[PDB]
Amino acid sequence: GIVEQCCTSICSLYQLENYCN
Amino acid sequence: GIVEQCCTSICSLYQLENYCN
Amino acid sequence: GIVEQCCTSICSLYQLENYCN
Amino acid sequence: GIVEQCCTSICSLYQLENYCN
Amino acid sequence: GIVEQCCTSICSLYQLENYCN
Amino acid sequence: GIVEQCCTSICSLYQLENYCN
Amino acid sequence: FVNQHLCGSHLVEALYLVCGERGFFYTP
Amino acid sequence: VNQHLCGSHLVEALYLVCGERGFFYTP
Amino acid sequence: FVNQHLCGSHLVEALYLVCGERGFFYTP
Amino acid sequence: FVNQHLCGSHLVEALYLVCGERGFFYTP
Amino acid sequence: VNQHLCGSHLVEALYLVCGERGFFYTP
Amino acid sequence: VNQHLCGSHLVEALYLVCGERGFFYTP
Ligand SMILES: [Cl-]
Ligand SMILES: [Cl-]
Ligand SMILES: [Zn+2]
Ligand SMILES: [Zn+2]
């Protein structure tokens, strides 16, 4: 998930945006 | 300025991008 | 809502727990 | 202390509460 | 107090240093 | 730079101050 | 408006800590 | 601890990028 | 009330950085 | 005055995330 | 640096969980 | 990620220590 995807390596704004709603 | 624009109104990330560089 | 309840009054951690899950 | 107890591994709310007052 | 002094006026880091220890 | 100087090891207030202006 | 934007930021912060493994939704 | 701390930056970043929409978060 | 709750959060933050090895008490 | 000091803190935070490798200047 | 950064999250978390009582912190 | 997170604390610390002057930041 986001912790898996964005904590081992940076997420762009667009990548982070997959977790909106 | 940024304080005058974004502390009175909410500024989105696209507005804020104009103060980068 | 949470903004309406906790930005007008201070909300403790027990109040806030009701918006978890 | 808290840095010893809560930075090598997560502290619950109750664990953190030992450091109140 | 610190809230009464630094939430009404802006407090610099030198003002704030007086509430350390 | 600051990331090089202040993320591998703590910077004092005075050290951080080199990056003001 | 701003008042509440900034408060929202602290609220998510606090919900993060409080909710634990529950997690949470936030909408403005 | 390192990922609890990252999570906390993540929600803050979500808060801003998501806007009106809001977001969901679970660890 | 909220104004000051949120300011308190920044204040602890700033006292953290400023006080260093001194540390600090905070009460609301 | 305080209102804006505290908002500035969130603004730098947001500029940090948004600007990426650009970076930014901030002045009050 | 890793523990200075953790400390900063710690005080914030203390600020919220302790409430009226407040707290004490030393590194 | 560890340095992106440190950066975020850095700017906050800069914001406070620099005051009227402000600061510049680049990663
Ligand atoms: Cl605030
Ligand atoms: Cl961190
Ligand atoms: Zn704030
Ligand atoms: Zn952090």
Coordinates of C-alpha atoms and ligand atoms in Angstrom, one line a residue:
Chain A
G1 CA 0.0 0.0 0.0
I2 CA 1.0 3.6 0.4
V3 CA 3.3 2.7 3.3
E4 CA 4.8 -0.1 1.1
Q5 CA 4.9 2.3 -2.0
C6 CA 5.9 5.7 -0.5
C7 CA 8.1 5.0 2.5
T8 CA 10.8 2.8 1.0
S9 CA 11.1 5.4 -1.8
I10 CA 9.6 8.9 -2.7
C11 CA 6.2 9.3 -4.3
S12 CA 5.3 12.0 -6.7
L13 CA 2.3 14.1 -6.3
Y14 CA 0.5 12.0 -9.0
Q15 CA 1.6 8.8 -7.2
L16 CA 0.2 10.1 -3.9
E17 CA -3.0 11.0 -5.7
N18 CA -3.8 7.4 -6.2
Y19 CA -4.8 7.4 -2.5
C20 CA -7.3 10.2 -2.7
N21 CA -11.2 9.8 -2.1
Chain B
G1 CA 2.6 37.8 -1.7
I2 CA 2.1 34.1 -0.7
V3 CA 1.0 35.1 2.8
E4 CA -1.4 37.6 1.5
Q5 CA -2.8 35.2 -1.2
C6 CA -2.8 31.9 0.8
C7 CA -3.5 32.9 4.4
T8 CA -6.7 34.7 3.3
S9 CA -7.9 32.2 0.7
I10 CA -7.0 28.5 0.6
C11 CA -4.4 27.9 -2.0
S12 CA -4.3 24.5 -3.8
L13 CA -1.0 22.8 -4.8
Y14 CA -1.2 24.3 -8.3
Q15 CA -1.4 27.8 -6.9
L16 CA 1.5 27.1 -4.6
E17 CA 3.5 25.7 -7.5
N18 CA 3.8 29.3 -8.8
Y19 CA 6.0 30.2 -5.8
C20 CA 8.5 27.4 -6.5
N21 CA 12.0 27.6 -7.9
Chain C
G1 CA -18.7 16.9 11.0
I2 CA -15.2 16.8 12.5
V3 CA -14.3 20.2 11.2
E4 CA -17.5 21.7 12.6
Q5 CA -17.1 19.9 16.0
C6 CA -13.2 20.2 16.5
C7 CA -12.3 23.4 14.9
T8 CA -14.8 25.4 17.0
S9 CA -14.3 23.5 20.3
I10 CA -11.1 21.6 21.3
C11 CA -11.6 17.9 20.8
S12 CA -9.8 15.4 23.1
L13 CA -8.3 12.1 21.8
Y14 CA -11.5 10.3 23.0
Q15 CA -13.8 12.6 20.9
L16 CA -11.5 12.1 18.0
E17 CA -11.5 8.3 18.4
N18 CA -15.2 8.4 17.2
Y19 CA -14.0 9.4 13.7
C20 CA -11.7 6.5 13.3
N21 CA -12.1 3.3 11.2
Chain D
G1 CA 13.4 7.2 28.6
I2 CA 10.8 8.1 26.1
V3 CA 13.4 8.3 23.3
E4 CA 14.7 5.0 24.5
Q5 CA 11.2 3.5 24.9
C6 CA 9.2 5.0 21.9
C7 CA 11.8 5.6 19.1
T8 CA 13.2 2.1 18.8
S9 CA 9.5 0.8 18.7
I10 CA 5.9 2.3 18.8
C11 CA 4.3 3.4 22.0
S12 CA 0.6 3.2 22.5
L13 CA -1.4 6.1 23.7
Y14 CA -1.3 4.6 27.3
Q15 CA 2.5 4.2 27.1
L16 CA 3.0 7.8 26.0
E17 CA 0.8 8.8 28.8
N18 CA 3.4 7.8 31.3
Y19 CA 5.2 11.0 30.3
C20 CA 2.4 13.4 31.1
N21 CA 2.5 16.1 33.9
Chain E
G1 CA 2.3 32.4 30.2
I2 CA 3.8 31.2 27.0
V3 CA 0.3 30.9 25.3
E4 CA -0.6 34.4 26.5
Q5 CA 2.7 35.9 25.3
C6 CA 3.3 33.9 22.1
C7 CA -0.1 33.2 20.7
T8 CA -1.0 37.0 20.7
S9 CA 2.4 38.3 19.6
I10 CA 4.9 36.4 17.5
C11 CA 7.8 35.1 19.7
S12 CA 11.3 34.7 18.3
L13 CA 13.6 31.8 19.3
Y14 CA 15.3 34.0 21.9
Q15 CA 12.0 34.8 23.6
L16 CA 11.1 31.1 23.5
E17 CA 14.5 30.2 25.0
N18 CA 13.2 31.7 28.3
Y19 CA 10.7 28.8 28.7
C20 CA 13.3 26.1 28.3
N21 CA 14.8 23.9 31.1
Chain F
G1 CA 24.4 21.3 1.5
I2 CA 22.0 21.4 4.4
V3 CA 20.7 17.9 3.6
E4 CA 24.3 16.8 3.5
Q5 CA 25.3 18.8 6.7
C6 CA 22.1 18.5 8.9
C7 CA 20.6 15.1 8.1
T8 CA 23.5 12.8 8.7
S9 CA 24.0 14.6 12.1
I10 CA 22.3 17.4 14.1
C11 CA 22.8 21.1 13.4
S12 CA 22.7 23.7 16.0
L13 CA 20.6 26.8 15.7
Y14 CA 23.8 28.8 14.6
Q15 CA 24.6 26.0 12.0
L16 CA 21.1 26.2 10.6
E17 CA 21.4 29.9 10.4
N18 CA 24.0 29.6 7.6
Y19 CA 21.0 28.8 5.4
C20 CA 19.0 32.0 6.1
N21 CA 18.2 34.8 3.5
Chain G
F1 CA -11.7 29.1 5.5
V2 CA -7.9 29.2 6.2
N3 CA -8.5 28.8 10.0
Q4 CA -10.1 25.5 9.0
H5 CA -7.7 24.4 6.4
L6 CA -4.9 24.7 9.0
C7 CA -7.0 23.0 11.7
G8 CA -7.7 20.1 9.3
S9 CA -4.0 19.5 9.0
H10 CA -3.7 19.1 12.7
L11 CA -6.8 17.0 12.8
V12 CA -5.4 14.4 10.3
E13 CA -2.3 14.4 12.3
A14 CA -4.3 13.6 15.4
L15 CA -6.5 11.1 13.7
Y16 CA -3.3 9.4 12.5
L17 CA -2.0 8.9 16.0
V18 CA -5.4 8.1 17.6
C19 CA -6.8 5.7 15.1
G20 CA -3.8 3.4 15.0
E21 CA -4.5 0.3 12.8
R22 CA -8.1 1.4 12.3
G23 CA -7.1 4.2 10.0
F24 CA -9.6 6.8 8.9
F25 CA -11.2 8.7 6.1
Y26 CA -10.9 12.4 6.0
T27 CA -12.9 14.8 3.7
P28 CA -13.1 18.6 3.9
Chain H
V1 CA 9.1 3.6 14.4
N2 CA 10.6 4.7 11.0
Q3 CA 7.4 3.8 9.2
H4 CA 5.1 5.3 11.8
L5 CA 6.9 8.5 11.3
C6 CA 6.8 8.2 7.5
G7 CA 3.0 7.6 7.8
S8 CA 2.6 10.8 9.6
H9 CA 4.2 12.7 6.7
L10 CA 2.1 10.7 4.3
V11 CA -1.2 11.8 5.7
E12 CA -0.1 15.4 5.7
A13 CA 0.9 15.1 2.1
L14 CA -2.3 13.4 1.3
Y15 CA -4.3 16.1 3.1
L16 CA -2.8 18.7 0.7
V17 CA -2.7 16.8 -2.6
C18 CA -6.3 15.4 -2.3
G19 CA -8.0 18.7 -1.5
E20 CA -11.9 18.7 -1.6
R21 CA -11.9 15.0 -2.3
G22 CA -10.2 14.0 0.9
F23 CA -8.5 10.6 1.3
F24 CA -8.5 7.3 3.2
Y25 CA -5.7 6.0 5.3
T26 CA -4.9 2.6 6.9
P27 CA -1.5 1.3 8.2
Chain I
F1 CA -9.7 28.2 22.2
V2 CA -8.9 26.3 19.0
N3 CA -6.6 29.2 17.7
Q4 CA -4.6 28.5 20.9
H5 CA -4.8 24.7 20.8
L6 CA -3.2 24.9 17.3
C7 CA -0.7 27.5 18.3
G8 CA 0.3 25.3 21.3
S9 CA 1.2 22.6 18.9
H10 CA 3.6 24.9 17.1
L11 CA 5.0 26.1 20.3
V12 CA 6.0 22.7 21.6
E13 CA 7.5 22.1 18.2
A14 CA 9.6 25.3 18.6
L15 CA 10.5 24.7 22.2
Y16 CA 11.7 21.2 21.1
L17 CA 14.1 22.7 18.6
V18 CA 15.2 25.6 20.8
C19 CA 15.6 24.0 24.1
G20 CA 17.9 21.3 22.9
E21 CA 19.3 19.2 25.8
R22 CA 17.6 21.4 28.3
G23 CA 14.2 20.1 27.4
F24 CA 11.1 21.8 28.7
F25 CA 7.7 21.5 30.5
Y26 CA 4.6 22.5 28.7
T27 CA 1.1 22.9 30.3
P28 CA -2.0 24.4 28.6
Chain J
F1 CA 0.1 38.3 13.1
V2 CA 0.1 34.9 14.8
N3 CA -2.6 33.6 12.5
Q4 CA 0.0 34.3 9.8
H5 CA 3.1 33.1 11.5
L6 CA 1.3 29.7 11.9
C7 CA 0.0 29.7 8.4
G8 CA 3.6 30.4 7.2
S9 CA 4.7 27.2 8.8
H10 CA 2.2 25.2 6.9
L11 CA 3.0 27.1 3.7
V12 CA 6.7 26.2 3.9
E13 CA 5.6 22.6 4.5
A14 CA 3.5 22.6 1.4
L15 CA 6.0 24.4 -0.7
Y16 CA 8.5 21.7 0.4
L17 CA 6.3 19.0 -0.9
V18 CA 5.2 20.8 -4.1
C19 CA 8.4 22.3 -5.3
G20 CA 10.4 19.1 -5.3
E21 CA 13.8 19.5 -6.8
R22 CA 13.0 23.2 -7.7
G23 CA 13.2 24.2 -4.1
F24 CA 12.0 27.7 -3.0
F25 CA 12.7 30.9 -1.2
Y26 CA 10.4 31.9 1.6
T27 CA 10.4 35.4 3.3
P28 CA 7.8 36.7 5.8
Chain K
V1 CA 19.3 12.8 13.2
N2 CA 16.8 9.8 13.2
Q3 CA 16.2 10.3 17.0
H4 CA 16.0 14.1 16.8
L5 CA 13.2 13.6 14.2
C6 CA 11.5 11.0 16.3
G7 CA 11.6 13.3 19.3
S8 CA 9.8 16.0 17.4
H9 CA 6.9 13.6 16.7
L10 CA 7.0 12.5 20.3
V11 CA 6.4 15.9 21.7
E12 CA 3.6 16.5 19.3
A13 CA 2.0 13.2 20.3
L14 CA 2.6 14.1 24.0
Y15 CA 0.9 17.5 23.4
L16 CA -2.3 15.7 22.3
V17 CA -2.5 12.7 24.6
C18 CA -1.6 14.7 27.8
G19 CA -4.2 17.5 27.4
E20 CA -4.9 19.9 30.3
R21 CA -2.0 18.1 32.3
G22 CA 0.7 19.0 29.9
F23 CA 4.0 17.1 29.9
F24 CA 7.7 17.3 30.4
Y25 CA 10.4 16.5 27.8
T26 CA 14.2 16.1 27.9
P27 CA 16.4 14.4 25.3
Chain L
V1 CA 12.5 8.6 2.0
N2 CA 14.6 9.2 5.2
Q3 CA 16.1 12.4 3.7
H4 CA 12.8 13.6 2.2
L5 CA 11.5 13.4 5.8
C6 CA 14.5 15.1 7.3
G7 CA 14.2 17.9 4.7
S8 CA 10.7 18.6 5.9
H9 CA 11.9 19.1 9.5
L10 CA 14.7 21.2 8.1
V11 CA 12.5 23.7 6.4
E12 CA 10.4 24.0 9.5
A13 CA 13.4 24.6 11.6
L14 CA 14.7 27.1 9.1
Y15 CA 11.3 28.9 9.1
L16 CA 11.7 29.6 12.8
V17 CA 15.4 30.3 13.2
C18 CA 15.6 32.7 10.2
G19 CA 12.6 34.9 11.1
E20 CA 12.1 38.2 9.2
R21 CA 15.0 37.2 6.8
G22 CA 13.4 34.1 5.5
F23 CA 15.5 31.4 3.8
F24 CA 16.1 29.5 0.6
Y25 CA 15.8 25.7 0.2
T26 CA 16.8 23.2 -2.5
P27 CA 17.1 19.4 -2.2
Ligands
CL1 CL -2.0 26.1 12.7
CL2 CL 10.4 12.0 10.5
ZN3 ZN -0.8 24.7 12.5
ZN4 ZN 9.1 13.5 10.7

